[PDB]
Amino acid sequence: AFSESLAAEISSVSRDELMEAIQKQEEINFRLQDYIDRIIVAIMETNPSILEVK
Amino acid sequence: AFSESLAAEISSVSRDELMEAIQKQEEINFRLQDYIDRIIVAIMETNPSILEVK
Amino acid sequence: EYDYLFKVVLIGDSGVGKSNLLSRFTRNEFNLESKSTIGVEFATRSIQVDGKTIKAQIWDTAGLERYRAITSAYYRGAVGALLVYDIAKHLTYENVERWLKELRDHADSNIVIMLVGNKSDLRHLRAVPTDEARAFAEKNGLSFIETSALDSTNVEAAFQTILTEIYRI
Amino acid sequence: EYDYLFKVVLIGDSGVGKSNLLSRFTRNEFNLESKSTIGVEFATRSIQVDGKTIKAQIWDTAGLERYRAITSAYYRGAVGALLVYDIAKHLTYENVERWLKELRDHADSNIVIMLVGNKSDLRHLRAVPTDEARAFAEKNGLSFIETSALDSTNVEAAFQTILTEIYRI
Numbered sequence: 187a188f189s190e191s192l193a194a195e196i197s198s199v200s201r202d203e204l205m206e207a208i209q210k211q212e213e214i215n216f217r218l219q220d221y222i223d224r225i226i227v228a229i230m231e232t233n234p235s236i237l238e239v240k
Numbered sequence: 241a242f243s244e245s246l247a248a249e250i251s252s253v254s255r256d257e258l259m260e261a262i263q264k265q266e267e268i269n270f271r272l273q274d275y276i277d278r279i280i281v282a283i284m285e286t287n288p289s290i291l292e293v294k
Numbered sequence: 295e296y297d298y299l300f301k302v303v304l305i306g307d308s309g310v311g312k313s314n315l316l317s318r319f320t321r322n323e324f325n326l327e328s329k330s331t332i333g334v335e336f337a338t339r340s341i342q343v344d345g346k347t348i349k350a351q352i353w354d355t356a357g358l359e360r361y362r363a364i365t366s367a368y369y370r371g372a373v374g375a376l377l378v379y380d381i382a383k384h385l386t387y388e389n390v391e392r393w394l395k396e397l398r399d400h401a402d403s404n405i406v407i408m409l410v411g412n413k414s415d416l417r418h419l420r421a422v423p424t425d426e427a428r429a430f431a432e433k434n435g436l437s438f439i440e441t442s443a444l445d446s447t448n449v450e451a452a453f454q455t456i457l458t459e460i461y462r463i
Numbered sequence: 464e465y466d467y468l469f470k471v472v473l474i475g476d477s478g479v480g481k482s483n484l485l486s487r488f489t490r491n492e493f494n495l496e497s498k499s500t501i502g503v504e505f506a507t508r509s510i511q512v513d514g515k516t517i518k519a520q521i522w523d524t525a526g527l528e529r530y531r532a533i534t535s536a537y538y539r540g541a542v543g544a545l546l547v548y549d550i551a552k553h554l555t556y557e558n559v560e561r562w563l564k565e566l567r568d569h570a571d572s573n574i575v576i577m578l579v580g581n582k583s584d585l586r587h588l589r590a591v592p593t594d595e596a597r598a599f600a601e602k603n604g605l606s607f608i609e610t611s612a613l614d615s616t617n618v619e620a621a622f623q624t625i626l627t628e629i630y631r632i
C-alpha cells in the first residue's frame with residue numbers, strides 16, 4: 187500500500203543533514219585521494235621502480 | 241503545510257540506492273585511510289624524521 | 295634482456311576492467327572481486343615483434359575524472375594508450391571522447407591509441423553493439439578490439455596488436 | 464642541544480582541537496578552518512624544567528576510533544598523553560574512557576596522562592561543566608586543565624605541567 191511504500195522512503199534523519207553527510211564524506215574522499223596522489227607522483231618522479239607489481 | 245514539509249524529505253533516488261551510495265563511500269574512505277596509514281607506519285619505522293613539521 | 299621498452303597506459307572509466315586486463319596479460323590472473331585501484335602501478339611482459347624483444351611496461355591507475363597529482367607523470371613517456379570501456383555499460387562508451395581529450399591534454403600527440411571494448415563475455419548484459427563501436431573507432435582513426443579479461447578472449451591479441459603498431463610507427 | 468627528549472602524544476575525538484593545540488604550542492599559530500589530520504606528524508619545542516633542557520616531541524594524528532596501521536607506532540616510546548575533549552561537545556567527554564582503554568591497549572602502563580578540556584573560549588556553547596570534569600580527573604588519577612588553543616588560555620600551562628610531571632616521574 188501507499189503509506190508503506192512512502193514510509194520506506196522517509197529517513198529518520200532530515201534530508202538537509204543527509205546532504206551535509208554526503209558533502210562531508212565526498213570532501214574526505216577527495217582529500218585522501220589527493221594526499222595519496224601527491225605521495226605517488228613524488229615516487230614516480232624519483233624512483234618509479236617502487237611502483238612495479240613484481 | 242504538511243505536503244510541502246513532506247516533499248522536502250523525499251529524494252528522487254530510492255532510499256535503498258541512497259544507502260548503497262553511503263556504504264560505497266564509507267568503504268572507499270576506509271580503504272584510502274588504511275592505504276595512507278600503511279605508508280605512514282612504514283615511515284614511522286624507518287625514518288620518522290620525515291614526519292616532523294619543521 | 296630486451297631491445298625496446300614501450301610504456302603503455304590503461305585508461306577508461308572506473309569499473310571497466312583495466313586492472314584485470316593488466317593482471318591477465320602480465321600474470322595470467324583475474325579477480326571477480328577486484329576493488330578500485332588506489333595508487334599507480336605497472337607490470338612488465340616481454341614479447342617478440344618482428345624479430346625483436348619488446349618489453350611492454352603496462353601502467354594502471356583508477357579511471358577517475360577529477361584532476362589528479364599523478365596525471366601528467368602517468369602519461370609521461372607513454373607511446374601507447376589502451377582506452378577501455380565496458381561493453382555492458384553504455385555510459386563508459388559515451389565517455390570515450392572525454393578520454394580522447396585527456397590524451398590530447400596530457401599525452402604525446404603521437405601516442406598510439408587502441409579502443410578496447412572489455413567484458414565481451416557479458417553477452418546477455420551487452421549495451422554497446424560491436425558493429426557500432428567498430429564504426430566509431432574507424433571514424434576516429436583508432437584501432438579497435440573487444441576483450442574479456444574474465445575468459446581471456448582477445449587479451450593477448452589486444453596487447454600484441456598495440457605493441458606491434460608502436461614498434462612499426 | 465637538550466638534556467632529555469620526551470615524546471608526548473595528542474589523543475581524543477575528531478574535532479576536539481588536537482592539531483591546534485600542537486600548532487599553538489610549537490608555532491604560536493591557530494587555524495579556525497583546520498581540517499581533519501590525514502597522516503601523522505610531530506613538532507618540537509624546548510622548555511626549561513628544574514634547570515634542565517627538555518625537548519618536547521609532540522605527536523598528532525586524527526582521533527579516529529577505528530583500528531589503524533599507525534596506532535602501535537604512534538604510542539611507541541610515548542611518556543605522556545594529552546587526552547583532549549571539547550568542552551562544548553559532551554560526546555567527546557563521554558568518549559574519554561574509550562581513550563583511556565586505548566592507552567592501556569597500546570601504550571606504556573607508566574604513561575603520564577593529562578585530561579584536557581579544550582575550547583574554553585566557547586562559554587555560551589559549553590556542555591561540560593568545569594567542576595564535573597575536574598572531579599572526574601581526580602577520581603581517575605589524571606591531571607586536569609582546561610585550554611583554548613584559540614585565545615591561548617592555559618596552553619603553555621598545559622604542556623608545562625605534563626612535561627614537568629614526566630620529568631619528575
Ligand SMILES: Nc1nc2c(ncn2[C@@H]2O[C@H](COP(=O)(O)OP(=O)(O)OP(=O)(O)O)[C@@H](O)[C@H]2O)c(=O)[nH]1
Binds near residue numbers: 308313326413442
Ligand atoms: N564479466 C566480466 N567482468 C570483468 C571483466 N574485467 C573486469 N571485470 C570485473 O569488473 C569489475 C571492475 O574491474 P577492474 O579491473 O577492477 O576495473 P578498473 O577499470 O581497474 O576499475 P578502477 O580501478 O576503479 O578504475 C571487477 O568486479 C572485475 O572482476 C571482464 O572481462 N568480464
Ligand SMILES: Nc1nc2c(ncn2[C@@H]2O[C@H](COP(=O)(O)OP(=O)(O)OP(=O)(O)O)[C@@H](O)[C@H]2O)c(=O)[nH]1
Binds near residue numbers: 476480612
Ligand atoms: N572555539 C575554539 N575552536 C577551536 C579550538 N581549538 C580548535 N578549534 C576548532 O575546532 C575545529 C577542529 O580543530 P582541530 O585542531 O582540527 O581538531 P583535531 O582534534 O585535530 O581533529 P582531527 O584531526 O580530526 O582529529 C577547527 O575548526 C578549529 O579551528 C579552541 O580552542 N576554541
Ligand SMILES: [Mg+2]
Binds near residue numbers: 314330355356
Ligand atoms: Mg583498477
Ligand SMILES: [Mg+2]
Binds near residue numbers: 482483523
Ligand atoms: Mg587534527
